[PDB]
Predict the 3D structure of the following.
Amino acid sequence: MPKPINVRVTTMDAELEFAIQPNTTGKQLFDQVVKTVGLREVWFFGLQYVDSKGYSTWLKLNKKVTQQDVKKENPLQFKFRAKFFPEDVSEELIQEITQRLFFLQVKEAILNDEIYCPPETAVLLASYAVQAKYGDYNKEIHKPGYLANDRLLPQRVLEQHKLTKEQWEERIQNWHEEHRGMLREDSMMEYLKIAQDLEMYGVNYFEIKNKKGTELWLGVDALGLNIYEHDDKLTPKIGFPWSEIRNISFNDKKFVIKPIDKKAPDFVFYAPRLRINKRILALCMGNHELYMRRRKP
């Protein structure tokens, strides 16, 4: 009789542990995480792991976890993250847990500079973060230097010699004050409301190449597909809302976007590896499906 497989699943602020049977599927594991956390908006999340070759991958819910090539460590290591992003945070994130998890994940991306964010608004976002962590600004408890150990701004903004750490920490402090009577739960939402308007927010970039062999970026988000110039990942040069696309298919290294648009040329591009094109297509299908459920439902 086969011994249980120990697995560890981490959310943005929790660590869960389970002992899974050799035949449990991606879904059974998924359901266990969801039930334990008490999350209902499950369509946004997925279980992420690294395979033998060292690449981040999403667990396939329809097959045994033992047969998906996850690194053989004692406790198998999984990350529970948002895979898809809502079109409007306000309208789609009802529960507190879902709001907290999206908040911690997006803040991380901002802090790590994965999502460009202007200095001024970066400071604004930081203030809602300290409001959610410290609450109201009690001038007695929160003495000058209470934020000196927190990670609040991305390194890119601290490189502004214009000001110094304390001076930035002061600008953040002022906003901390204007948020005086705001609830913890509400500040995480104002944070997200400000963050979803950012150009890079919620888009998955991929390095692609066109017919002429020019290097370009392919962004897959909630609304559709965008083609960017290599030096500008903020503003799309060409776009394809899901409702403007008739069909998308690919020859192992060739991608074809067939538009519903009758008198419009097909858009073709090639991606480096095959792992990539396999994932690109999966994100396209996942975002498309949710794009529908918001409209045709």
Notes: Residues 132 and 184 are 4 Å apart (CA to CA). The two ends are 47 Å apart (CA to CA). The chain is about 35% helix and 25% strand. The domain at 4-82 is CATH 3.10.20.90 (Ubiquitin-like (UB roll)).
